[PDB]
Amino acid sequence: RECDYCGTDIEPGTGTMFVHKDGATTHFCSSKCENNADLGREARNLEWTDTAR
């Protein structure tokens, strides 16, 4: 599986899945990614993210 945020492969037996209000789903690999998302930041704009570089 891949982190719907940064893009790195989520280590099996790890991570969190956040269920949105509309029913959409988001698999996070870590707290760091979840937290950056809560700040309203988009992964493409963060240079360390595997979505960007």
Binding site: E11, P12, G13, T14
Partner: protein
């Protein structure tokens, strides 16, 4: 009317003092059933990771499905049964009769013992056989020690010595079995005693925490609300009633917490292998790299990394053995991050 409530902490693990031996001492052994064999083994705690397993349980709706399981990695290199001690039944319980030692000794066993230079194995053996004829022979155990030198991550070279009982068929057969093992060089491994999937009882001296208060040591409440601001925060209400005019040992008080012996029951042995398959990237924090004989114990194990832990076939298992569980994945992800 003052609601009821269970007391704070158990009264069955006391006194809560510092353990006399850092090396655990089993106070009970498995029953004599199958073929003769050593009833225990030892290793050094390394750390933890998780493994994906195929549901083994025949009664689980999830039978056959992927399942994530916590695992504690324990380095379990070969040990050495350096002697056969014999016990005799007496009106005052069991007492050691004699011991049959060997010649082949590990290069550094002298860091702990005054290794035998002159011994008569046959005389000791004879004394044991005569005792058996008389029908005064109690159980049979082996003086065993570890080889810390084989475990790079552990600073010690000084071996840890412990006695492990030998249970089996007839006493005659298990006596012979014992002697055979010893005579060789006493070299034996985890494989010889345990099989992946079996339940074992792991003993160990817990992580020390020095002196701690009743809240941490016994689980008593902290002062609440307004009381918490008066000058008392983590102290119990009282040491007891007016009468009896004395403090009962049952009241939760400050003291040594941690560094106690514990025998955790029914620990499933997930896998017994050798190599570096279980090692974590960057290395096990505060331990090092595993690359040799190991054992993957389900869940947690008492004690800190590097501490000696003991294995023993479960004396009171709840479930039937489900041998060699299918390990589909073992995490090697760094424990730092």
């Amino acid at each position: 009317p003052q609601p009821s409530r269970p007391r704070k902490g158990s009264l069955g693990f006391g006194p809560r003092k510092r353990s006399t031996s850092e090396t655990p001492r089993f106070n009970s052994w498995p029953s004599d059933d199958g073929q003769p064999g050593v009833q225990g083994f030892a290793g050094y705690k390394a750390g933890m990771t998780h493994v994906v397993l195929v549901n083994d349980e025949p009664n689980s709706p999830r039978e056959g499905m992927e399942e994530t399981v916590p695992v504690t990695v324990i380095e379990t290199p070969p040990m050495r049964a350096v002697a056969l001690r014999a016990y005799e039944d007496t009106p005052y319980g069991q007492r050691p009769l004699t011991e049959v030692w060997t010649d082949e000794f590990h290069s550094e066993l002298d860091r702990t013992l005054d290794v035998p230079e002159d011994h008569d194995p046959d005389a000791a053996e004879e004394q044991i056989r005569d005792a058996h004829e008389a029908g005064d022979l109690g159980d049979l155990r082996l003086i065993t020690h570890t080889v810390p030198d084989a475990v790079p991550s552990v600073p010690k070279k000084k071996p840890d010595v412990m006695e492990t009982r030998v249970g089996g068929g007839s006493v005659s057969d298990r006596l012979d079995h014992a002697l055979d093992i010893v005579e060789d060089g006493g070299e034996h491994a985890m494989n010889d005693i345990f099989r992946a999937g079996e339940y074992a009882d792991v003993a160990g001296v817990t992580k020390g925490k020095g002196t701690q208060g009743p809240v941490k040591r016994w689980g008593v409440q902290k002062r609440k609300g307004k009381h918490a601001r008066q000058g008392w925060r983590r102290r119990i209400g009282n040491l007891g009633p007016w009468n009896p005019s004395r403090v009962r040992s049952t009241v939760p008080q400050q003291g040594q917490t941690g560094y106690h012996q514990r025998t955790e029951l029914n620990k499933r042995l997930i896998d017994i292998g050798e190599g570096d398959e279980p090692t974590v990237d960057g290395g096990f924090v505060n331990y090092g790299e595993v690359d040799g004989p190991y054992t993957l114990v389900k869940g947690s194990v008492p004690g800190p990394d590097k501490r000696l832990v003991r294995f023993r076939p479960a004396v009171r298992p709840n479930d039937q053995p489900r041998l060699d569980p299918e390990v589909r994945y073992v995490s090697n992800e760094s424990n730092q991050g």
